Amino acid sequence: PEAFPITLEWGGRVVRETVYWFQYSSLNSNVYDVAMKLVTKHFPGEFGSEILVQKVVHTILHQTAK
Amino acid sequence: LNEVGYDDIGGCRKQLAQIKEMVELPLRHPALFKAIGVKPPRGILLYGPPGTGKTLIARAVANETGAFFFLINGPEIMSKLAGESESNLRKAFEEAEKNAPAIIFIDELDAIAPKREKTHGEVERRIVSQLLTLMDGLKQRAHVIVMAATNRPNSIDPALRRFGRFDREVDIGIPDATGRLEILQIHTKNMKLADDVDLEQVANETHGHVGADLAALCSEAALQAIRKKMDLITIDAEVMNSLAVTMDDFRWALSQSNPSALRETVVEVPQVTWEDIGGLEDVKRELQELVQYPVEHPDKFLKFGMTPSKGVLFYGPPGCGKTLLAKAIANECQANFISIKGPELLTMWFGESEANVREIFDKARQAAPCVLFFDELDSIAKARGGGGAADRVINQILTEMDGMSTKKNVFIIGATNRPDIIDPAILRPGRLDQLIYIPLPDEKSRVAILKANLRKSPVAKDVDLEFLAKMTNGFSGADLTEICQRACKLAIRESIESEIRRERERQTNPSEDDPVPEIRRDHFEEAMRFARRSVSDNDIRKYEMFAQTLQQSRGFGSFRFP
Amino acid sequence: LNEVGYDDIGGCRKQLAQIKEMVELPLRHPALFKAIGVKPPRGILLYGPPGTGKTLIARAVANETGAFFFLINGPEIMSKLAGESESNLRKAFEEAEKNAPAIIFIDELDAIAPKREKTHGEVERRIVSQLLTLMDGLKQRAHVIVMAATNRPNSIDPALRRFGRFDREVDIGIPDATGRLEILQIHTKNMKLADDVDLEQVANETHGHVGADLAALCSEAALQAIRKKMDLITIDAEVMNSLAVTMDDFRWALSQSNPSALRETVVEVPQVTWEDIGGLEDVKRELQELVQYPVEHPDKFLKFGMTPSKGVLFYGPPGCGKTLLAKAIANECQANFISIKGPELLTMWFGESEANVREIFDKARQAAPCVLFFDELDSIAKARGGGGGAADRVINQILTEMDGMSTKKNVFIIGATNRPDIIDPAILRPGRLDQLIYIPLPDEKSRVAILKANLRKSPVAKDVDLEFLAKMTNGFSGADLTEICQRACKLAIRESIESEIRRERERQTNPSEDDPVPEIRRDHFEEAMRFARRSVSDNDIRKYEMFAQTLQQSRGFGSFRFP
């Protein structure tokens, strides 16, 4: 569970949380799932959150890339 | 008997009735009109895509009414040399005067009098002015009605649309499913048709055809049958009568046909009914109040001194039947339905063509009562990021809504998945003031949606659509349609594979029944393995929060009255 | 015998068949058609790049059917003084009516009746109106078919495309490889070609050549041979009979070709096949279901009441055979394949010429069944940053055209995108590229197939074990394998040229043969593999595989049990 911080900036609110990453079978982390979970947890029922999810996915991909 | 009559006109029953009302009394009873001091119609302007039989409409009206029909052809007049064209126009109008009551039909008017900018040469402008003068002098001419045919109202010189000149305008437009069926029956009368063909089916299939396209399609089917029979053999009549056109020929023609009106906006009464989208009885009542009542009971609105609401705005998850609801309400009131998809709004935005919005409303005004539907009012807002909230296209929509007379029974119905980014200026009173939440379908609504989707698809009785709807909680209408289409796809694949296996068996054994004549229950079982919920609980959550925010401000419920 | 005939015309077999079916009955059986009472074709508008022998098609049809053929040349009519041109047109139509059945060919129609805006003089509009009047007056004329040739359908006055006018339309278009071969055979009939020439090779090598271009190429080869003979040396024919053009002459002519239709949109059935890209069995099945079934078994879809899917969207790492898969499925159904590269979409975007999208679809509609392929649907999205939304003018026009295309026509849109995320969501809705197919990196079998396909045209020593090369090239895209093959070929060519130079230099220094490298050997592939690069890192395939795993995880709701 590699932990790295990511900052959700949306609706004028900043919320920095650590993402756990299961890089290593079939339980490996999925950005399109962890980002959705993050936005739902911190910005539930928020319009236009898909672009925030895309931003989070990009950031997590950059962090995970070695 | 070959002289054209109303029997030979199809696909424009409403417009044909309008033209008949305009031109019956002035022509059937001309002397009566001259006795009374009542202004008759002078210039009628039939406009619509070419090949809709506008000339046929004029000729049929003239023949049935008995008036002398004089045909002026735009290209014919413009082909003549300078002076000869004006002389021809003068002679045509003089002939109509002599043999009154008469109908002068100017075909392809835009050829004679296009937009003033397009008129470059001096002779063209002189011809247009001569036509205008002839129209102005068309007062003491024994009720000589002049009808003209053009593509669009703006395609001709605006000076021709002034009073006294062409003033009454009829929008022939595109035939609808029933209209296409009528046209097919008219054009297939002489052709011997086998019982295989069912003209209503092709009429449903022949979307985008104008009537000349339908005539071409019928001719193509007849020629396909004749080609099929040609190898076997002034021409003997018994064989011709024996010759019959099969539904295979019509399907082949459909495949080879090139519709000429796939771009024209579709104005027609939608076939969608409330059954196709069950449930939402509260929204059904709301839509009824907004649309049906002001058109069915104008007296009540006048008596209570209320202005009918100009429109409403649907908001909810994508693919929940907003378009279905709009079409259903349009069908209930038998009012024409205009769909303006999000791509159209974005096209107007990108090309700076927001002026076209006016045209849209004009069209909606012509087909009154109408339900003008904007599928995605947030398209431009989304394209800009989702700067201020105002954009050129939505601003033009607001302008037209403000300029829309409430007496014309044109009701705007917006739709959006992002009600937050909708420009607030459109939700003010006198605009799409009311907001209606279209939630995900409930169990009854899901059952109705499944039944509607599986209406043209033979399905086994073992399928319990009630149970399927019960197990698909949270699925949108789009998801249910996806499940039905996937089940049909699995059935088609099974049928293809079984046919291939049987053919291969015959190949290896040259020495029957449908392997899968119905969409069996296992097909739905498999399709449910490719079924997703396109609307997650978060989307429902955000829509519910929006609705709750709207409703919370709507307090003051506990009002008293001593 | 010198008169033109169907044999004399090649490269447009499909369009020629369409013209045959349109015009044979009204012309072969005039009185019978009149007795039928059905409207025959009146205006047939052949359009396509110039030099494709449209007038040849018209003359061949007239000669084979015996219908009197009258030729009207646009420039010839316009050259005449004012009024004289109208008299010429009237006389032409009257003469054609006299010798009914007949065909009136208005060559270079746009010269007579261009778009109204292009016309400026009064006499130009007058002559256009005269032509329209005559076309409308064809009704009273018996068994007179008017054929017209124009570069593009939008090059002539729209008033000429109404009903009773040039309504029937036929896109001759540039010939394909088979069509080019047919044209070459037609134009090489009299030439006593040497046995060395294989017209198939040139037909493949003559991409972008119209029929007139191929005729000019054959003439140039003949002139090269005649030049050689004259340099060696009212005219005897035995030398001409013995004069033989060779592949040397044809290649020299190819060098001096200047094709006239290099920029024309190529529409043809691709030669690619599933074997060219092995594996991808699931994707092959899905593509078959989407394309072959609706085009080969319409009856099944009608019986089960489904609308065939309008298109699909491929997503995956670059250069994994998305184009190969699209071409393979197009070839499976023998459907025309139209590819719109990312540069084309970007050109439409930069120039604000999104209207051209309509033309593209029209082209596809004219080639039904067709497989419209968009090589990079995300090119515009990438060019915008990768602070507006996802919507853009070009993709919006693509959506508008996709919505407004009838499903009866078998035009299927296959989109390809290396970035499934950034593609505009509106394109993935039902009635659009709803299905998303993941094209992963080639597996071992697909790698073997790709290597075999790439090395098909190369003389490869049988010692090389392509199975081994594919085995340990795991993670290599199709582009990487193609690069390996090309680099091995480059090494082999360099070795061949170096050995030849050494041989000639040795002869020079030792005045006092065999091919040093007749085939690509194992050492060449080893050296090439020393240059091999993985164009797709583990992280990119991570992104794609994870997107697919997301689309599949949410595709749950299984365990369904109907009773």
Author numbering:
A (entry chain H): 589 to 612, 616 to 657
B (entry chain A): 198 to 430, 436 to 588, 594 to 718, 724 to 774
C (entry chain F): 198 to 430, 436 to 588, 593 to 718, 724 to 774
The authors write:
Interestingly, we also identified a region on VCPIP1 that engages VCP at its C-terminal domain (D2 domain), which we named “VCP interacting domain” (VCPID) after validating its functional relevance. In addition to the anticipated VCPIP1 UBX domain interaction with the VCP N-domain, we observed density corresponding to three VCPIP1 interfacing with the D2 domain dimers of VCP, which we later assigned to the VCPID domain of VCPIP1. The VCPIP1 VCPID interacts with the dimer through its alpha helices, while the β-hairpin loop connects to the VCPIP1 stalk region. VCPID N621, D627 and K754 also interact with VCP M757, L652 and Q645, respectively. The primary contacts of VCPID with the VCP D2 chain 2 are formed through insertion of VCPID F638 into a hydrophobic pocket formed by P626, Y755, and F758. The three VCPIDs interact exclusively with VCP and make no inter-domain contacts. We observed variable quality of density for the VCPIDs, more specifically the β-hairpin loops, suggesting that there is compositional and/or conformational heterogeneity in the binding region.
The AAA+ ATPase valosin-containing protein (VCP)/p97, known as cdc48 in Saccharomyces cerevisiae, is an essential and highly conserved protein involved in numerous cellular functions, such as regulating protein homeostasis, endolysosomal trafficking, membrane remodeling, chromatin regulation, autophagy, Golgi formation, and others. Its core function is to unfold ubiquitylated proteins in an ATP dependent fashion. Previous studies have established that post-mitotic Golgi reassembly requires presence of VCP, as well as two adapter proteins, VCPIP138, and p4734,35. VCPIP1, also known as VCIP135, is part of the ovarian tumor protease (OTU) family of DUBs, an essential family of enzymes that remove ubiquitin tags from proteins to regulate protein homeostasis and function.
